[PDB]
Amino acid sequence: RVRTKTVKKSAKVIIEKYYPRLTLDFETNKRVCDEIAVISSKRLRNKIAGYTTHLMKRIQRGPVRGISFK
Amino acid sequence: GGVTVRDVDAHKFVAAYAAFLKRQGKLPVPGWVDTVKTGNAKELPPQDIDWWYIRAASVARHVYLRKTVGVGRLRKVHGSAKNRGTRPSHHVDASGSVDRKIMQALEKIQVLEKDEERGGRRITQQGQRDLDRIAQTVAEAD
Amino acid sequence: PKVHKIRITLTSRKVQSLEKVCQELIERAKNKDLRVKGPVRMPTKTLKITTRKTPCGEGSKTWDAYEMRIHKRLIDLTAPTEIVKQIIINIEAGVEVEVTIAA
Amino acid sequence: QISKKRKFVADGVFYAELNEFFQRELAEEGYSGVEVRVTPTVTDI
Amino acid sequence: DVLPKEVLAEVGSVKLFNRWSYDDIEIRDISLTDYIQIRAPVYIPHSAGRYAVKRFRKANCPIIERLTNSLMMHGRNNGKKLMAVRIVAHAFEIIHLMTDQNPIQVAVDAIVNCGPREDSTRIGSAGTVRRQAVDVSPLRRVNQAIALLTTGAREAAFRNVKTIAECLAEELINAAKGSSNSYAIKKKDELERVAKSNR
Amino acid sequence: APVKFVKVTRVLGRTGSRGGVTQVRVEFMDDTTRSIIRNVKGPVRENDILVLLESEREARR
Amino acid sequence: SVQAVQVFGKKKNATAVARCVQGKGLIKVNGKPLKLFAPEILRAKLYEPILILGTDKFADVDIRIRVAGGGHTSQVYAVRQAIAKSIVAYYAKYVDEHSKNLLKQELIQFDRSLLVADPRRCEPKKFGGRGARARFQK
Amino acid sequence: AQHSVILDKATSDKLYKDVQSYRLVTVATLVDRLKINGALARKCLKDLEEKGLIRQVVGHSKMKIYTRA
Amino acid sequence: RRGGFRGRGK
Amino acid sequence: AQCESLRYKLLNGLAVRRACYGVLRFIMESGAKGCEVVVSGKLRAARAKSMKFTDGFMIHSGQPAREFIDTATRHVLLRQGVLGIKVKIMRG
RNA sequence: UAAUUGCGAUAACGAACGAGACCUUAACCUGCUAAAUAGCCCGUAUUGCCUUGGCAGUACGCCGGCUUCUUAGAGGGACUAUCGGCUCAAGCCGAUGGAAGUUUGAGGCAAUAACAGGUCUGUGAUGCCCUUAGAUGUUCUGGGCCGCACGCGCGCUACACUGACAGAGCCAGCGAGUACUCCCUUGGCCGAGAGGCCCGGGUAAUCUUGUUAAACUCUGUCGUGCUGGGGAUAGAGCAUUGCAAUUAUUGCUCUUCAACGAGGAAUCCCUAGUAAGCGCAAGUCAUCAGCUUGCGUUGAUUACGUCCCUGCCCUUUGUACACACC
Ligand SMILES: [Mg+2]
Ligand SMILES: [Mg+2]
Ligand SMILES: [Mg+2]
Ligand SMILES: [Mg+2]
Ligand SMILES: [Mg+2]
Ligand SMILES: [Mg+2]
Ligand SMILES: [Mg+2]
């Protein structure tokens, strides 16, 4: 269960471009991503929302190298 | 309370109706007994002597539960597998004359009548009352 | 002007064009104050063909299954005979329509 | 008067007939596919 | 009314199998519990379980059902649980008449006593065997005990006038004690002897 | 024979030429201090209980 | 008006539709009573959902079920699966659930499958089930 | 190997003095030690059942078992 | 008795 | 269509590579993100071989190869034998 | 990590294929849009039994109501969500909830460079050579491709009591069907049987078809004897298909009653609705399945590992090999 580069890049760019509007809850990010992005797959949208909600859990507790937001 | 065919066990009920039909003892027989195979797939005649009467009782039992039935349908209803030799077995139907005439005789005993409007044979007003009457004979027999 | 309770049957392999054909037909009929009956959902007709894949018989033995699907999506209406002629106009390619007066 | 299931194969073969003939005839004129629309009592290509 | 008069007798009391109880279980040893499951009684063994998906999921599964599965073997008898279940019930009825004790009382002691404790392992020696005589885990012990009991009945009843209904019963009653005249005992002691030699 | 009861406390990989045997650390359940290393043929979980005919023999590593 | 609820149960290919209507304590399956419709040894496998709950809680409930498709053990598993939804839907919808929750917890601790179905069907392959044909010389 | 299709007094006396002590009586037991045919054993079950000496435990079309009274 | 090909040695 | 253009140019006397190379430029101005041409047969020798020319992007695996890819193949007759041509174009 | 799948260190930076993504299908919806070629409730007439007020069946309704069950559209639904114990990270293990927690299950498609692999007997795809009117072209009659002292492969039926035989009980799914000539076939009659005759339905969710298949369940007969297990071989008789049935195309009845007691050295396939048991539909077809491709019924023991044999991938290393340890 390892996520590919397309999700890695999309999750990083969404997080750094739009940090505050989305939170640790997975359900909210599910509807946040597809409204502000053009994605051709439902499961891929789930892939992004699931991994992207993981990042803020560890950002909330200490910063992490390789990610920078406004 | 009142009981019907559905309220009694099938195995003992058909035996009871065979015993009841013993006492009337009036169904024509064209002499086919003791000579017929009762089915192409089969090889030996039934051992018990009144198979002509038990089969007719069971046929009248199932026609009570079915709305329209013919000889062709009963042909495959009573069929079974046949040992073709070294080839794998298949499904083939029973003999036609035996099943046709055993129920052709059953109309004139006033149990069921013809259904020429759409086909087949259906059960008659007073015909169903015969199978109904034995239901009470068996129900409180317990 | 005698109503005849027409019924029309449709057939196609693709699904979206046929669906939008019925989708556009239904408002054209409801807005004229015509009693319309719903778009019933007929079973899909699936067809398959199996043949040997290799053309010579050498090597390993492998099969493939071609297939084809057909849908009907029939609709009926209660209207006079002449009015239905102008209501089934402007149909696109592929979809074939057959009309039955059912008088 | 034929069933729909056999009709949908017969007209597919009809399309195949038109497509195959056109390669053998109009190859010089830059042929690239066709499409057929069937209407009652008249057809277009 | 809606229930048979037979089952109306047992409905008043605590739930158990209709013919025989599941109470008063043996106190004889340890290391075989936690792998024989008797806390949940069942009327008939037959059940469409999910016991073949994980490693130890089959450890919490009725033993009687395990016997039913092992009872059907040798090609022809695959999937015939209707045929097997009557045989198990009849064997449990037969063993009750030769001994007033509970049929599960005898069956449990048969399994807990007919399990081998040592086995020989295959270690390569370039054509020779360096049998190290390892021990056997409890789950493997009950697994082999079931197999020996069922294959004994099938071999004994093969081409004999006796029937498997009481053929199965007689090993269980024989194996309840140290009878030593059963097929299962022949293999269990034979295997222990070869492990003793190969120590 | 004075047969003894032992219980497994930890599993340490799978040894043997064919993976049938496993090497475990056992506990004698009579002197809780004592603990040795043995080999087992079947599947083993934590807190399982084994029956040992002879305890003096020891296994590799 | 009349109190009634409809539930359904499924198996591999066995569909068992049930109708629960407020009645007087009568139970019949496929029209015939429970004495008949089952194989003899599996006759035990139909009455447990009743006895585990108690006949006293079946005072004014009537159930009629129609079942078709599948095999012999499939029908008895479908009808036994349908009973749980019929009884729990009628109690949940029409009477206080103080009973319903204790019935549900007690029955599911005995058996979880009473409320959910088990999905199992076959897989197509180009040699049979899962095995290939015999090889000549490997 | 061969059994007896007819029952004589030499075998008849064995029944009425031994079945009072048998714990189980089955077709296998009779064909085993009485040296009688299976058909005769089945006859013996039904003839002696009505005499009031054995009681039914389980009945089946393939095997039947009887015990003491 | 046995063929010597296939380059097996000693 | 380009496949026939290549067939005509190779049917008349012309270098096989020059005819194939001209196609790649003719494809590129139209706006295709990639193309591939395959030529097989007797390349001026008794033994036969094949050559492939490729540029831009390429897909092989998914069903998008079924629609996003336009493919064609033709046979051309020469004085000595037969030559095969396969052309694929991906349109965005 | 299933993966050149990633975390990262870095004389490399940035990219292109393959994997993944993707498509079909099997699992959830008492929520939306609905349906007389699919059902339920309801209302009439009508039948039987208790008689009750009830229970079990029939026929009708076409705006009486509804879509849970049957059906296919638009969408929702799993993401490893939550929790515990490891780790900086990627990740792994267990539990709860949930229809579903191996990538949820199974498939389709699927890289570079290649083989003296197969096919000229699929093609009006094709070079060269050959015979072309005593024809290797075409066409008509008859025979042969099946001919048998022997060795080898893929299968079918069995060696029986966990069985055979006889009556009764009684449950599926995927599919197919009418021409310029009859294609699946209901019902009625005759006929031991195979078959024959007469009305009629269906170009098909409407009729065949509920394809009420087999296995299986209950009640009896036989009684371990190669016997009522087993059906090779052969005689006589009756029929259908076709222009034509002999070396019988096939089907049915009587009789004949072989070998075969779980199989040596060797050897194949397989991890859950899976193995095995059993049948059905379609293909070739005027008739013939012991063959293949799919569909459903009943439904298991044991493992959740390792590189020992037979093989695959990466790195270091050795070489007198490069047709490459044949
Ligand atoms: Mg790709
Ligand atoms: Mg892929
Ligand atoms: Mg490849
Ligand atoms: Mg014989
Ligand atoms: Mg066929
Ligand atoms: Mg050296
Ligand atoms: Mg080197």
Q: What is the DSSP string of J19-80?
A: HHHHHHHHHHTTT-SEEEEEEEE--SSSS-EEEEEEEE----SSTHHHHSEEEEEEEEE-SS
Both structure tokens of C53: 């894949």
- β-bridge mates for residue C100, sequence order: C7
Q: Distance (Å) from the C-alpha of residue E162 to the closest C-alpha of chain H?
A: 5
CA H47 to CA H35: how far, in whole Å?
Answer: 18
Query: Alpha helix locations (H) across chain C?
Result: 16-30
CA C34 to chain centre: 22
Judged by a CB distance cut-off of 8 A, whether residue G117 touches chain E is no
Q: Identify the CA nearest to G100 among candidates G110, G111, G92.
A: G92
Contacts of I1 (CB under 8 A, 6+ apart): none
Ligand closest to J60 (CA) is 1
- Give distance in angstroms: CA of J61 to centre of ligand 1: 6
Rounded to 10°, the helix E164-175/E138-157 angle is: 140
CA J41, J45, J46 angle in degrees (round to 5)? 85
Contact by Cβ (8 Å): A51, A44: no
Look up residue F24 and give its amino acid: V
Q: List Cα–Cα distances, B48 to B53, B95, H23, in angstroms.
A: 11, 19, 35
In whole angstroms, give the CA distance from residue E120 to residue E133.
4
C63-70 vs C45-52, strand pairing mode: antiparallel
Instruction: Report the alpha-carbon distance of residue C62 to residue F50 in Å, rounded.
Output: 53
| Separation CA H67–CA E174 (nearest Å) | 20
Neighbours of ion ligand 1 (CB under 5 A): J 61
What is the bridge-based pairing of β-strands G4-10 and G15-22? antiparallel
CA dist., res. E93 & res. E102, Å (int): 10
**E128 reaches F (C-beta below 8 A):** no
- For residue C91, what are its two tokens? 């149909």
Distance J65 CA to ligand 1 centre (A): 10
**Which residue has 């062709």 as its token pair?**
B72
Half-sphere exposure of F47 (CA within 13 A, CB side): 3
Torsion of CA E117, E138, E61, G100, to 10 degrees: 140
Give the gap in angstroms from C-alpha H46 to the nearest C-alpha of chain E.
20
G18: three-class secondary structure by DSSP? strand
Neighbour count for residue J92 (Cβ, 10 Å): 8
CB-strand contact J52/K, under 7 Å: yes
What residues form DSSP beta bridges with G7? G18
Residues of J in contact with D19 (CB under 8 A): none
Residue B1 near residue B135 (C-beta atoms within 8 A): no
**Run of H or E including J82:** strand J82-90
With a CB cutoff of 8 Å and minimum separation 6, the contacts of D21 are none
The neighbouring-strand residues paired with J49 are J41
CA dihedral F11, F15, F20, F25 (to 10 degrees): -30
Output the CA–CA distances (angstroms, integers) from residue D3 to C8, D13, F49, in the order listed: 16, 16, 73
Which window residues (49-78, chain E) lie with Cβ within 7 Å of strand K? 51-55, 58, 66, 69-78
Contacts of G37 (CB under 8 A, 6+ apart): G29, G30, G75
| E118 close to E11: Cβ distance less than 8 angstroms | no
Tell me the β-bridge partners of J90. J34, J69
The answer to whether the C-beta of B84 is closer than 7 A to strand K is yes
- The span from the CA of D41 to the CA of D18, in Å, is 19
Crossing angle for the helix pair A42-59 and A5-17, to the nearest 10 degrees:
60
Number of neighbouring beta carbons within 10 Å of residue A37 = 13
Which whole-number Å values give the CA distances from A56 to A2, A3, A14, E66, in the listed order?
18, 17, 12, 50
Tokens of E47: 């059940």
Most distant CA pair in chain I: distance in Å?
Answer: 16
Query: Please, which residues have CB within 8 angstroms of residue C21's CB and are 6 or more apart in sequence?
Result: C10, C91, C92, C95
Tokens of C4: 């005849």
Q: Are A18 and A11 in contact (CB under 8 A)?
A: no
CA A57 to chain CA centroid, Å, is 11
D2 CA: nearest nucleotide by C1'? K203
Distance of CA J42 to the CA centre of its chain: 16
How far apart are the C-alpha atoms of B58 and A29, rounded to whole Å? 69
CB contact at 8 A, J51 and J36 = no
Helix (H, G, I), strand (E, B) or coil at G72: helix
Tokens of G90: 């009628």
F41 touches strand K (CB under 7 A): no
Angle, CA of H40, H46 and H50, to the nearest 5°? 140
Q: What is the DSSP letter of F26?
A: E
Contact E162, F49 (CB under 8 A): no
Residues 6+ apart with CB under 8 A from B96: B71, B75
Pairing relationship of beta strands H65-67 and F22-27 according to DSSP bridges: unpaired
Binning chain E into helix, strand and coil, the percentages to the nearest 5 are 45, 5, 50
Q: Name the residue in chain E with its Cα closest to that of G34.
A: E2
Tokens of C103: 């008088």
> Is the shortest CB-to-strand distance from B129 to strand K under 7 Å?
yes
- Residue E134 in contact with residue E121, Cβ under 8 Å? yes
Residues 64-103 of C with CB under 7 A from strand K: 64-65, 71, 74
Distances in Å between the alpha carbon of E137 and those of A56, E54, E144, J28? 48, 18, 11, 72
The Cα F41–Cα E136 span in angstroms is: 5
Instruction: Tell me if F53 sits within 8 A of F3, measured CB to CB.
Output: yes
Instruction: Report the distance separating Cα B115 and Cα E163, nearest Å.
Output: 52
Q: Which uninterrupted H or E stretch holds G15?
A: strand G15-22
Two tokens, residue B41: 């797939």
Cβ atoms within 10 A of the Cβ of A9, count? Answer: 10
List, as one string, the DSSP characters of chain B: ----GGGS-HHHHHHHHHHHHHHH------S-TTT--SSTT--S--SSTTHHHHHHHHHHHHHTT-SSB-HHHHHHHS-EEE--SSSPPEEE---HHHHHHHHHHHHHTTSEEE-TTTSSEEE-HHHHHHHHHHHHHHHTT-
Residue–nucleotide distance: D9 CA to K203 C1' (Å): 15
Tokens 């082999």 found at: E144
Helical packing angle, E63-71 and E81-97, nearest 10°: 110
What are the structure tokens assigned to B73, written together? 């349908």
Q: Which two tokens stand for residue G79?
A: 């009808």
Is beta strand C7-11 parallel, antiparallel or unpaired with respect to C96-100?
Answer: antiparallel
Q: Does E123 touch chain F (CB under 8 A)?
A: yes
Task: Find which nucleotide's C1' atom is closest to B10's CA.
Answer: K169
Report how far ligand 1's centroid is from the alpha carbon of J68 (Å): 13
Note whether E129 contacts F: Cβ–Cβ < 8 A.
no
Output the CA H27–ligand 4 centroid distance in Å: 26
The CA distance from F44 to C41, in Å, is 57
Rounded distance between C-alpha atoms, residue A52 and residue A23, angstroms = 10
CA–CA dist D5, J24 (Å, integer): 44
Judge H/E contact: 3 or more CB pairs < 8 A.
yes
What CA dihedral angle connects G37, G41, G45 and G48, to 10 degrees? 100
Token digits of residue B136: 């009470």
Rounded Cα distance, J33 and J53, in Å: 15
Is residue G125 annotated as involved in ligand binding? yes
Does J1 sit within 8 Å of D27, measured CB to CB? no
What is chain B's Cα-based Rg?
16
Is C75:C37 a contact under the CB 8 Å cutoff?
yes
* Chain D residues with CB-CB distance to C45 below 8 A: 5
Tell me how far CA of residue A34 lies from CA of A16, A30, A43, J65, in angstroms: 17, 7, 11, 26
CA-wise closest residue to G66 among G20, G30, G35: G30
In angstroms, this model's resolution equals 3.3
The spacing between the Cα labelled CA in E75 and the C1' in K249, in angstroms, equals 37
The Cα–Cα gap between B56 and B68 comes to 17
- Distance CA B89 to C1' K257 in A: 21
If we measure between CA atoms, which residue out of G132, G28, G135, G5 comes closest to residue G79? G28
Which bases of strand K have any atom within 7 Å of the beta carbon of a protein residue? Answer: 1, 3, 5-8, 16-23, 26-28, 30, 33-35, 37, 40-42, 47-50, 52, 54-59, 68-74, 76-82, 89-92, 99-100, 103, 105-106, 108-114, 116-119, 122, 125-127, 153-157, 160-163, 165-179, 185-195, 203-205, 209-210, 212-225, 230-232, 251-254, 261, 267-280, 289-306, 308, 325-326
Which residue do the tokens 């209904």 mark? E165
Q: Give which of G72, G61, G83 is closest to G16, Cα–Cα.
A: G83
Tokens at residue E193, please?
């002897």
Can you give the length of chain B in residues?
142
Distance CA A43, CA C70 (A): 29
Cα separation, B20 vs B57, whole angstroms:
10
User: Is some CB atom of chain E closer than 8 A to the CB atom of G28?
Assistant: no
Phi, psi (deg, nearest 5) at residue B55: -65, -40
Amino acid in position E65: E
Kindly report the number of other CB atoms within 10 A of residue E107's CB atom. Answer: 22
Task: Measuring from the CA of residue E161 to each C1' atom, give the nucleotide at the shortest distance.
Answer: K224
User: CA F29 to CA F44: how far, in whole Å?
Assistant: 17
Query: What are the C-alpha distances in Å from C39 to residues A18, A53, J8?
Result: 46, 43, 54
